[PDB]
Amino acid sequence: ARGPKKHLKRLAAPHHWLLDKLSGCYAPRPSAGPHKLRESLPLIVFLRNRLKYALNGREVKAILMQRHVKVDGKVRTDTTYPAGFMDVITLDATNENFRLVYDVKGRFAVHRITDEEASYKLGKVKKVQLGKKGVPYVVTHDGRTIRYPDPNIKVNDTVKIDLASGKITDFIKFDAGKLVYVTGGRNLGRIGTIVHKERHDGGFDLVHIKDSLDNTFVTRLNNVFVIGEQGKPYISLPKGKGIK
Protein backbone atom coordinates (compact mmCIF):
# COMPACT_ATOMS: atom_id res chain seq x y z
CA ALA A 1 0.00 0.00 0.00
CA ARG A 2 1.03 3.60 -0.64
CA GLY A 3 -0.26 4.82 2.73
CA PRO A 4 -2.16 4.00 5.92
CA LYS A 5 -5.08 1.60 5.63
CA LYS A 6 -8.61 2.81 6.38
CA HIS A 7 -10.74 -0.35 5.97
CA LEU A 8 -11.11 -3.44 8.16
CA LYS A 9 -12.77 -6.59 6.82
CA ARG A 10 -14.84 -8.73 9.16
CA LEU A 11 -12.77 -11.92 9.01
CA ALA A 12 -9.64 -9.85 9.70
CA ALA A 13 -11.26 -8.12 12.68
CA PRO A 14 -10.41 -9.20 16.24
CA HIS A 15 -12.14 -12.44 17.17
CA HIS A 16 -13.13 -11.33 20.66
CA TRP A 17 -15.54 -8.71 19.30
CA LEU A 18 -17.89 -11.52 18.18
CA LEU A 19 -18.98 -10.06 14.84
CA ASP A 20 -21.31 -12.09 12.64
CA LYS A 21 -19.45 -13.22 9.53
CA LEU A 22 -22.56 -12.80 7.34
CA SER A 23 -23.90 -9.48 8.65
CA GLY A 24 -21.73 -7.54 6.22
CA CYS A 25 -18.34 -7.43 4.53
CA TYR A 26 -16.52 -4.80 6.64
CA ALA A 27 -16.08 -4.31 10.38
CA PRO A 28 -15.66 -1.06 12.33
CA ARG A 29 -12.00 -0.09 12.04
CA PRO A 30 -10.93 1.50 15.35
CA SER A 31 -9.65 5.01 14.84
CA ALA A 32 -6.36 6.12 16.33
CA GLY A 33 -6.55 6.59 20.07
CA PRO A 34 -5.40 5.54 23.53
CA HIS A 35 -5.35 1.77 22.88
CA LYS A 36 -4.04 -0.66 20.29
CA LEU A 37 -6.31 -1.60 17.40
CA ARG A 38 -6.35 -5.29 18.32
CA GLU A 39 -6.73 -4.53 22.05
CA SER A 40 -9.60 -2.02 21.75
CA LEU A 41 -13.39 -2.20 21.54
CA PRO A 42 -14.88 0.59 19.37
CA LEU A 43 -17.88 2.34 20.88
CA ILE A 44 -20.14 1.17 18.04
CA VAL A 45 -19.57 -2.46 19.01
CA PHE A 46 -20.17 -1.65 22.68
CA LEU A 47 -23.44 0.18 22.06
CA ARG A 48 -24.82 -2.17 19.38
CA ASN A 49 -23.43 -5.71 19.68
CA ARG A 50 -23.06 -5.73 23.49
CA LEU A 51 -25.58 -3.38 25.12
CA LYS A 52 -28.18 -3.62 22.31
CA TYR A 53 -29.35 -0.05 22.92
CA ALA A 54 -28.67 0.67 19.24
CA LEU A 55 -29.72 -1.65 16.42
CA ASN A 56 -27.34 -0.24 13.80
CA GLY A 57 -25.07 2.58 12.86
CA ARG A 58 -26.54 6.10 12.68
CA GLU A 59 -28.55 5.36 15.81
CA VAL A 60 -25.18 4.79 17.47
CA LYS A 61 -24.09 8.03 15.81
CA ALA A 62 -27.15 9.85 17.16
CA ILE A 63 -26.58 8.46 20.66
CA LEU A 64 -22.99 9.69 20.45
CA MET A 65 -23.67 13.21 19.18
CA GLN A 66 -26.40 13.90 21.68
CA ARG A 67 -23.38 13.72 24.02
CA HIS A 68 -24.85 10.97 26.22
CA VAL A 69 -21.70 8.79 26.20
CA LYS A 70 -18.62 9.71 28.23
CA VAL A 71 -15.34 7.79 28.04
CA ASP A 72 -13.20 8.39 31.14
CA GLY A 73 -15.41 11.35 32.01
CA LYS A 74 -15.03 13.09 28.63
CA VAL A 75 -17.68 13.21 25.92
CA ARG A 76 -16.75 11.37 22.72
CA THR A 77 -18.56 11.60 19.38
CA ASP A 78 -16.48 9.25 17.18
CA THR A 79 -18.28 5.99 16.46
CA THR A 80 -15.01 4.05 16.16
CA TYR A 81 -13.37 5.61 19.21
CA PRO A 82 -11.01 2.90 20.55
CA ALA A 83 -12.20 2.29 24.08
CA GLY A 84 -10.05 -0.35 25.74
CA PHE A 85 -9.07 -2.14 28.92
CA MET A 86 -10.03 -0.34 32.15
CA ASP A 87 -11.91 2.44 30.34
CA VAL A 88 -14.92 3.95 32.12
CA ILE A 89 -18.00 4.43 29.94
CA THR A 90 -20.73 6.53 31.56
CA LEU A 91 -24.30 6.86 30.30
CA ASP A 92 -25.96 9.54 32.42
CA ALA A 93 -29.39 9.26 30.80
CA THR A 94 -29.79 5.59 31.74
CA ASN A 95 -27.71 5.96 34.94
CA GLU A 96 -25.07 3.35 34.05
CA ASN A 97 -21.31 3.13 34.51
CA PHE A 98 -19.18 0.41 32.91
CA ARG A 99 -15.55 -0.64 33.18
CA LEU A 100 -14.08 -2.50 30.22
CA VAL A 101 -12.61 -5.71 31.67
CA TYR A 102 -12.13 -9.01 29.89
CA ASP A 103 -13.92 -12.08 31.20
CA VAL A 104 -12.39 -15.54 31.58
CA LYS A 105 -13.37 -16.29 27.99
CA GLY A 106 -11.11 -13.39 27.03
CA ARG A 107 -13.70 -10.96 25.65
CA PHE A 108 -14.63 -7.55 27.02
CA ALA A 109 -17.44 -8.01 29.53
CA VAL A 110 -20.33 -5.68 30.32
CA HIS A 111 -19.49 -4.94 33.97
CA ARG A 112 -21.66 -2.35 35.72
CA ILE A 113 -19.99 -0.26 38.43
CA THR A 114 -20.92 2.38 40.97
CA ASP A 115 -20.28 6.10 40.54
CA GLU A 116 -17.66 6.11 43.30
CA GLU A 117 -15.71 3.38 41.53
CA ALA A 118 -16.40 5.07 38.18
CA SER A 119 -14.61 8.19 39.46
CA TYR A 120 -11.18 6.58 38.94
CA LYS A 121 -9.20 4.13 36.81
CA LEU A 122 -5.86 2.30 36.92
CA GLY A 123 -2.95 2.68 34.53
CA LYS A 124 0.07 0.40 34.14
CA VAL A 125 3.23 2.51 34.12
CA LYS A 126 4.70 1.82 30.69
CA LYS A 127 7.43 4.45 30.98
CA VAL A 128 8.99 6.90 33.46
CA GLN A 129 11.17 9.70 32.09
CA LEU A 130 12.24 13.30 32.58
CA GLY A 131 10.63 15.74 30.16
CA LYS A 132 11.70 19.19 29.06
CA LYS A 133 12.79 21.56 31.84
CA GLY A 134 13.69 18.61 34.08
CA VAL A 135 10.07 17.60 34.68
CA PRO A 136 9.46 13.90 35.47
CA TYR A 137 6.46 12.16 33.94
CA VAL A 138 4.90 8.71 33.64
CA VAL A 139 3.35 7.23 30.50
CA THR A 140 0.65 4.66 31.24
CA HIS A 141 -0.83 1.89 29.10
CA ASP A 142 -3.62 4.19 27.86
CA GLY A 143 -1.23 6.87 26.62
CA ARG A 144 -1.80 9.21 29.56
CA THR A 145 1.24 11.31 30.40
CA ILE A 146 1.14 12.39 34.05
CA ARG A 147 3.76 14.95 35.00
CA TYR A 148 5.25 15.35 38.48
CA PRO A 149 4.81 11.73 39.62
CA ASP A 150 5.83 10.21 42.91
CA PRO A 151 9.51 9.13 42.80
CA ASN A 152 8.65 5.64 44.06
CA ILE A 153 6.67 4.91 40.88
CA LYS A 154 8.63 2.70 38.47
CA VAL A 155 7.82 0.85 35.26
CA ASN A 156 5.37 -2.09 35.58
CA ASP A 157 3.77 -0.34 38.58
CA THR A 158 0.08 0.59 38.59
CA VAL A 159 -1.11 4.15 39.29
CA LYS A 160 -4.65 5.02 40.39
CA ILE A 161 -5.74 7.98 38.25
CA ASP A 162 -8.63 10.28 39.14
CA LEU A 163 -10.64 10.92 35.98
CA ALA A 164 -11.82 14.43 36.90
CA SER A 165 -8.32 15.85 37.44
CA GLY A 166 -6.10 13.19 35.85
CA LYS A 167 -3.71 12.95 38.81
CA ILE A 168 -2.25 9.98 40.65
CA THR A 169 -4.10 9.16 43.88
CA ASP A 170 -2.09 6.06 44.84
CA PHE A 171 0.26 3.50 43.34
CA ILE A 172 1.02 -0.21 43.59
CA LYS A 173 4.53 -1.58 43.12
CA PHE A 174 5.27 -4.67 41.04
CA ASP A 175 6.25 -7.30 43.62
CA ALA A 176 5.57 -10.92 44.48
CA GLY A 177 2.27 -11.57 46.25
CA LYS A 178 0.44 -8.80 44.39
CA LEU A 179 -2.93 -9.41 42.74
CA VAL A 180 -2.55 -9.44 38.98
CA TYR A 181 -4.66 -9.56 35.82
CA VAL A 182 -3.74 -11.08 32.44
CA THR A 183 -4.44 -8.80 29.46
CA GLY A 184 -3.36 -11.00 26.54
CA GLY A 185 -2.58 -14.45 25.26
CA ARG A 186 -4.38 -17.69 26.00
CA ASN A 187 -4.54 -16.92 29.75
CA LEU A 188 -6.23 -13.61 28.91
CA GLY A 189 -8.73 -12.64 31.60
CA ARG A 190 -7.41 -14.85 34.41
CA ILE A 191 -6.59 -13.38 37.82
CA GLY A 192 -3.96 -14.53 40.29
CA THR A 193 -1.14 -13.63 42.64
CA ILE A 194 2.47 -13.18 41.59
CA VAL A 195 4.93 -15.92 42.58
CA HIS A 196 8.15 -15.13 40.70
CA LYS A 197 9.33 -12.86 37.89
CA GLU A 198 11.93 -14.67 35.80
CA ARG A 199 14.39 -12.15 34.35
CA HIS A 200 16.28 -12.53 31.06
CA ASP A 201 18.51 -9.66 29.98
CA GLY A 202 18.02 -8.94 26.29
CA GLY A 203 14.86 -11.07 26.26
CA PHE A 204 11.24 -11.09 27.33
CA ASP A 205 10.69 -11.40 31.07
CA LEU A 206 8.39 -14.19 32.28
CA VAL A 207 6.15 -14.12 35.36
CA HIS A 208 4.64 -17.04 37.28
CA ILE A 209 1.09 -16.53 38.57
CA LYS A 210 -0.89 -18.70 41.00
CA ASP A 211 -4.68 -18.53 41.07
CA SER A 212 -6.92 -18.96 44.11
CA LEU A 213 -7.33 -22.63 43.12
CA ASP A 214 -3.50 -23.00 43.41
CA ASN A 215 -3.10 -23.64 39.66
CA THR A 216 0.07 -22.05 38.29
CA PHE A 217 0.70 -20.54 34.86
CA VAL A 218 3.50 -18.54 33.24
CA THR A 219 3.03 -15.45 31.09
CA ARG A 220 5.14 -12.75 29.45
CA LEU A 221 5.59 -9.53 31.40
CA ASN A 222 4.00 -7.33 28.71
CA ASN A 223 0.76 -9.25 29.43
CA VAL A 224 0.71 -8.42 33.17
CA PHE A 225 -1.41 -5.78 34.95
CA VAL A 226 -1.31 -5.29 38.72
CA ILE A 227 -4.77 -4.61 40.18
CA GLY A 228 -4.21 -4.79 43.95
CA GLU A 229 -2.83 -6.96 46.69
CA GLN A 230 -4.12 -10.47 47.30
CA GLY A 231 -7.66 -10.37 48.69
CA LYS A 232 -8.09 -6.61 48.11
CA PRO A 233 -8.48 -5.61 44.47
CA TYR A 234 -8.70 -1.88 43.87
CA ILE A 235 -11.52 -2.45 41.34
CA SER A 236 -14.66 -4.56 41.18
CA LEU A 237 -14.09 -7.86 39.40
CA PRO A 238 -16.43 -9.55 36.90
CA LYS A 239 -18.28 -12.70 37.82
CA GLY A 240 -15.94 -15.67 38.19
CA LYS A 241 -13.09 -13.54 39.57
CA GLY A 242 -10.76 -14.50 36.73
CA ILE A 243 -10.85 -18.20 37.63
CA LYS A 244 -10.20 -20.87 34.99
Binding site: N97, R112, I113, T114, E116, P233, S236
Partner: peptide, 19 residues
Amino acid sequence: PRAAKKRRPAAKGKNLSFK
Protein backbone atom coordinates in the same frame (compact mmCIF):
# COMPACT_ATOMS: atom_id res chain seq x y z
CA PRO B 1 -14.97 -2.54 45.80
CA ARG B 2 -18.37 -4.14 45.21
CA ALA B 3 -19.98 -4.11 41.78
CA ALA B 4 -23.18 -2.15 41.26
CA LYS B 5 -26.31 -3.95 42.43
CA LYS B 6 -28.31 -5.43 39.57
CA ARG B 7 -31.41 -3.43 38.61
CA ARG B 8 -34.66 -5.24 37.89
CA PRO B 9 -36.13 -4.81 34.39
CA ALA B 10 -38.05 -1.54 34.35
CA ALA B 11 -40.50 -2.80 31.72
CA LYS B 12 -42.58 -5.98 31.53
CA GLY B 13 -44.79 -7.60 28.93
CA LYS B 14 -48.27 -6.16 28.38
CA ASN B 15 -51.05 -8.07 26.66
CA LEU B 16 -54.18 -7.30 24.64
CA SER B 17 -56.75 -9.25 22.61
CA PHE B 18 -59.17 -8.01 19.95
CA LYS B 19 -61.70 -9.05 17.27
